[PDB]
Amino acid sequence: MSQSNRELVVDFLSYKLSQKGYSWSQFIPMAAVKQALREAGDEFELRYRRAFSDLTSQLHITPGTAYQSFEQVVNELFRDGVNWGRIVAFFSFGGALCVESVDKEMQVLVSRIASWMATYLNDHLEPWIQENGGWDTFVDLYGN
Ligand SMILES: CC1(C)CCC(c2ccc(Cl)cc2)=C(CN2CCN(c3ccc(C(=O)NS(=O)(=O)c4ccc(N[C@H](CCN5CCOCC5)CSc5ccccc5)c(S(=O)(=O)C(F)(F)F)c4)cc3)CC2)C1
CB 15 within 8 A of CB 38: yes
43 lines ligand 1 (CB under 6 A): yes
Ligand 1, atom 24: nearest CA belongs to which residue? 85
Segments making up each domain of the chain, as ranges: 1-144
Q: Is the CB of 5 under 6 A from ligand 1?
A: no
CATH class of the structural domain 1-144: mainly alpha
* Centroid of ligand 1 to alpha carbon of 25 (angstroms): 29
Distance 17 CA to ligand 1 centre (A): 21
Give one DSSP letter per residue of the chain, joined into a string.
-HHHHHHHHHHHHHHHHHHTT---TT--HHHHHHHHHHHHHHHHHHHTHHHHHHHHHH----TTTHHHHHHHHHHHHTTT---HHHHHHHHHHHHHHHHHHHHTT-TTHHHHHHHHHHHHIIIIIHHHHHHTTHHHHHHHHHH-
Q: Determination technique for this PDB entry?
A: X-ray
Per-residue exposure over 46-71, b if at least 16 CB sit within 10 Å of its own CB, e if not: eeeeeebeebeeeeebeeeebeeebe
Instruction: Using the mean position of ligand 1's atoms as its centre, give its distance from the Cα of residue 86 in Å.
Output: 6
In angstroms, this model's resolution equals 2.3
Q: Which of 34, 5, 41, 36 is nearest to 20 (CA)?
A: 41
Taking CA atoms only, the protein residue closest to ligand 1 atom 15 is 51
